[PDB]
Amino acid sequence: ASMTGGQQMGRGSNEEFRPEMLQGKKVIVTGASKGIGREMAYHLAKMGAHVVVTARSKETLQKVVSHCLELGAASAHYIAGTMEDMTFAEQFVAQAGKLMGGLDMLILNHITNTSLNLFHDDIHHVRKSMEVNFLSYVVLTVAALPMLKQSNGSIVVVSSLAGKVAYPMVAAYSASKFALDGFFSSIRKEYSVSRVNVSITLCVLGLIDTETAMKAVSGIVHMQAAPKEECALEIIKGGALRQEEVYYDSSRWTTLLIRNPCRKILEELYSTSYNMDRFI
Amino acid sequence: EFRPEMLQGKKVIVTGASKGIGREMAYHLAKMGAHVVVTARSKETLQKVVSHCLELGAASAHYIAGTMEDMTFAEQFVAQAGKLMGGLDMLILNHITNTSLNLFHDDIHHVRKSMEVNFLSYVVLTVAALPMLKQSNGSIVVVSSLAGKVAYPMVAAYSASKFALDGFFSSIRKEYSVSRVNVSITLCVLGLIDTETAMKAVSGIVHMQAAPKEECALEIIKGGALRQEEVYYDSSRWTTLLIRNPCRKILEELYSTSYNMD
Numbered sequence: 281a282s283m284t285g286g287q288q289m290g291r292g293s294n295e296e297f298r299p300e301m302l303q304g305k306k307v308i309v310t311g312a313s314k315g316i317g318r319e320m321a322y323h324l325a326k327m328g329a330h331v332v333v334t335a336r337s338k339e340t341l342q343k344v345v346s347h348c349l350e351l352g353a354a355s356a357h358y359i360a361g362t363m364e365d366m367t368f369a370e371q372f373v374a375q376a377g378k379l380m381g382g383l384d385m386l387i388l389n390h391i392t393n394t395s396l397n398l399f400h401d402d403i404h405h406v407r408k409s410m411e412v413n414f415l416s417y418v419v420l421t422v423a424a425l426p427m428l429k430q431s432n433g434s435i436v437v438v439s440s441l442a443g444k445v446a447y448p449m450v451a452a453y454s455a456s457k458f459a460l461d462g463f464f465s466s467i468r469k470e471y472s473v474s475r476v477n478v479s480i481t482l483c484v485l486g487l488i489d490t491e492t493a494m495k496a497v498s499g500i501v502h503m504q505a506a507p508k509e510e511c512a513l514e515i516i517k518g519g520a521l522r523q524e525e526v527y528y529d530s531s532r533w534t535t536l537l538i539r540n541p542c543r544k545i546l547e548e549l550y551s552t553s554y555n556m557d558r559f560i
Numbered sequence: 561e562f563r564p565e566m567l568q569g570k571k572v573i574v575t576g577a578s579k580g581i582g583r584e585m586a587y588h589l590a591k592m593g594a595h596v597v598v599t600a601r602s603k604e605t606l607q608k609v610v611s612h613c614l615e616l617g618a619a620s621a622h623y624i625a626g627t628m629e630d631m632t633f634a635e636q637f638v639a640q641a642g643k644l645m646g647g648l649d650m651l652i653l654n655h656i657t658n659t660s661l662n663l664f665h666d667d668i669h670h671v672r673k674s675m676e677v678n679f680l681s682y683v684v685l686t687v688a689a690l691p692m693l694k695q696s697n698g699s700i701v702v703v704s705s706l707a708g709k710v711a712y713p714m715v716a717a718y719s720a721s722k723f724a725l726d727g728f729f730s731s732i733r734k735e736y737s738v739s740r741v742n743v744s745i746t747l748c749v750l751g752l753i754d755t756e757t758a759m760k761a762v763s764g765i766v767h768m769q770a771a772p773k774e775e776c777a778l779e780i781i782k783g784g785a786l787r788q789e790e791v792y793y794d795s796s797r798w799t800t801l802l803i804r805n806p807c808r809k810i811l812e813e814l815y816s817t818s819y820n821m822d
């Protein structure tokens with residue numbers, strides 16, 4: 281270890297993933313007691329990463345930590361709390377960073393509990409969705425950025441197809457997912473001109489076979505679900521490869537149509553329409 | 561094809577109407593002979609607007625001053641505006657919290673305030689307005705930006721709030737379609753407009769072609785009156801060519817046969 285040095289990232293490392301890219305990496309996974317988050321903790325553990333998992337339930341988080349250690353995690357810890365509390369979110373990153381002695385990857389995955397319902401007057405669900413699904417991600421990013429700058433790290437943002445296109449019955453949820461794209465795609469452009477070597481990966485997911493999703497869709501929505509294990513891995517890969525966006529859906533037609541080439545062209549056209557020297 | 565007659569005698573709310581695009585919309589509506597209720601925080605600028613609206617030919621013109629940071633004011637404002645006009649045909653959501661071009665570092669207060677004013681108040685105003693708009697088979701007009709469709713640096717909080725509007729209003733538009741709620745939703749995607757606020761904020765940063773505020777204000781009204789889902793208004797021909805997302809419309813139509821609704 282003290283007599284060891286070098287790098288895993290060389291020729292083709294921006295295109296071809298290897299589990300060794302995560303060996304010894306310091307990773308935070310939010311909403312990691314169940315679903316996709318837990319699957320990501322498990323994949324990272326198998327890759328020999330140091331992990332700090334979070335969710336509200338300490339009991340479910342203990343089980344994830346124990347299984348992570350069994351799978352071969354370099355180290356595994358949990359810190360339980362609610363992402364409704366901006367003080368907890370801020371404190372959580374400092375404590376997770378202290379446990380690992382730094383941070384390489386921040387995986388933002390938690391959401392507030394949501395169901396399929398038509399919008400009528402539930403402004404409280406709209407506000408809570410914005411607070412938990414979006415604002416806490418911004419707070420976690422602010423708290424994590426100094427450590428990420430030090431490691432030339434990665435931010436992984438778990439979004440949804442409902443964060444790129446419109447679906448009925450998910451108005452509050454969809455607003456919070458669209459907000460993530462607007463926020464994180466803007467700071468990615470800022471990091472580029474400011475030479476902040478921190479990658480940002482927005483993950484656009486279709487229906488995933490998590491217990492929460494399968495229960496919420498039941499009898500309302502009839503779509504093909506994709507497996508949570510492969511989903512979790514595809515998210516990690518995108519983050520390790522520093523890809524701007526990850527798309528994961530069971531339909532081949534979705535993967536074919538989801539990309540927005542015109543958005544990328546437009547953004548390139550505007551890159552020379554603004555003088556930024558004053559901020560850089 | 562739009563006709564100014566489409567707005568004659570219509571009951572319209574215009575938010576952030578003390579200046580810029582909002583004031584220009586109030587003026588166009590006044591000339592078309594609509595009943596208008598304008599809002600912003602500045603009493604003295606709203607009074608001037610009301611006066612000029614009356615000189616232009618408005619059926620009636622009123623103002624109610626207050627901050628859209630206050631969700632209670634937003635909710636009560638619609639009830640009082642509706643009482644003044646005896647109903648509501650069009651709700652024009654245009655106000656934003658004061659914003660400047662800056663890199664994002666740690667101003668969570670500006671992120672939260674932008675979400676509250678630019679987005680959450682629009683939802684509160686829509687909830688308060690919907691019973692009257694259902695009665696008139698009315699219209700909701702949402703003023704967004706190109707920063708609400710594509711990424712730009714220095715506007716992270718602002719852009720997140722504009723993207724949130726697209727996600728929220730495009731979802732409820734699908735719900736209104738299947739629920740047979742005859743209330744149209746127009747999302748307006750604007751480029752640089754020659755308002756005093758924008759010209760002052762982009763000074764030394766953006767020179768470019770700034771689209772005139774008067775034509776902008778009319779194009780928003782037209783889209784709303786024509787019940788168009790989206791309005792695009794920019795000075796660049798390349799923008800109008802690339803801004804549309806036909807693949808998004810195709811995907812949404814493909815998923816349309818995946819829901820029950822009953």
Ligand SMILES: NC(=O)c1ccc[n+]([C@@H]2O[C@H](COP(=O)([O-])OP(=O)(O)OC[C@H]3O[C@@H](n4cnc5c(N)ncnc54)[C@H](OP(=O)(O)O)[C@@H]3O)[C@@H](O)[C@H]2O)c1
Nearest residue numbers: 311312313314315316335336337362363440488490492493
């Ligand atoms: N599954 C799908 O179909 C699907 C589709 C598209 C996108 N996605 C995205 O994928 C991510 C994971 O989804 P999932 O289906 O895996 O969810 P899930 O199985 O329901 O897990 C949600 C996680 O977040 C935690 N959580 C809930 N409320 C919280 C709060 N207030 N504060 C902190 N943590 C909280 C939960 O544990 P506690 O309750 O113990 O806190 C749990 O660990 C989400 O961002 C979701 O939007 C999922």
Ligand SMILES: NC(=O)c1ccc[n+]([C@@H]2O[C@H](COP(=O)([O-])OP(=O)(O)OC[C@H]3O[C@@H](n4cnc5c(N)ncnc54)[C@H](OP(=O)(O)O)[C@@H]3O)[C@@H](O)[C@H]2O)c1
Nearest residue numbers: 576577578580581600601602627628705752753755757758
């Ligand atoms: N100008 C552009 O280049 C441009 C480009 C794209 C999109 N847009 C969109 O166009 C719309 C109008 O922009 P504009 O350029 O015309 O802006 P503007 O001239 O600065 O006017 C903003 C309006 O909002 C009001 N307002 C500000 N803070 C408020 C608060 N807390 N509560 C209630 N009202 C508040 C202002 O009045 P008070 O200060 O008196 O309250 C004013 O009437 C916005 O939605 C903006 O995003 C503009």
Ligand SMILES: CO[C@]12C[C@@H]3C[C@H](C1)[C@@](CC(=O)N1CC(O)C1)(c1ccc(F)cc1)[C@@H](C3)C2
Nearest residue numbers: 394395440441442447450486487493496497501
């Ligand atoms: C994790 O919790 C859930 C709770 C609700 C059901 C389900 C799981 C999901 C998944 C999701 O994000 N997408 C699949 C769509 O492809 C987008 C959904 C399901 C079908 C939709 F049409 C829209 C939204 C949202 C809303 C998030």
Ligand SMILES: CO[C@]12C[C@@H]3C[C@H](C1)[C@@](CC(=O)N1CC(O)C1)(c1ccc(F)cc1)[C@@H](C3)C2
Nearest residue numbers: 659660661705706707712715751752757758761
């Ligand atoms: C009304 O207040 C303003 C204050 C700030 C400057 C200016 C006017 C605007 C206008 C705007 O939304 N767009 C023009 C772009 O075409 C989108 C802007 C300017 C240059 C950008 F690169 C991005 C955003 C935002 C942010 C809104």
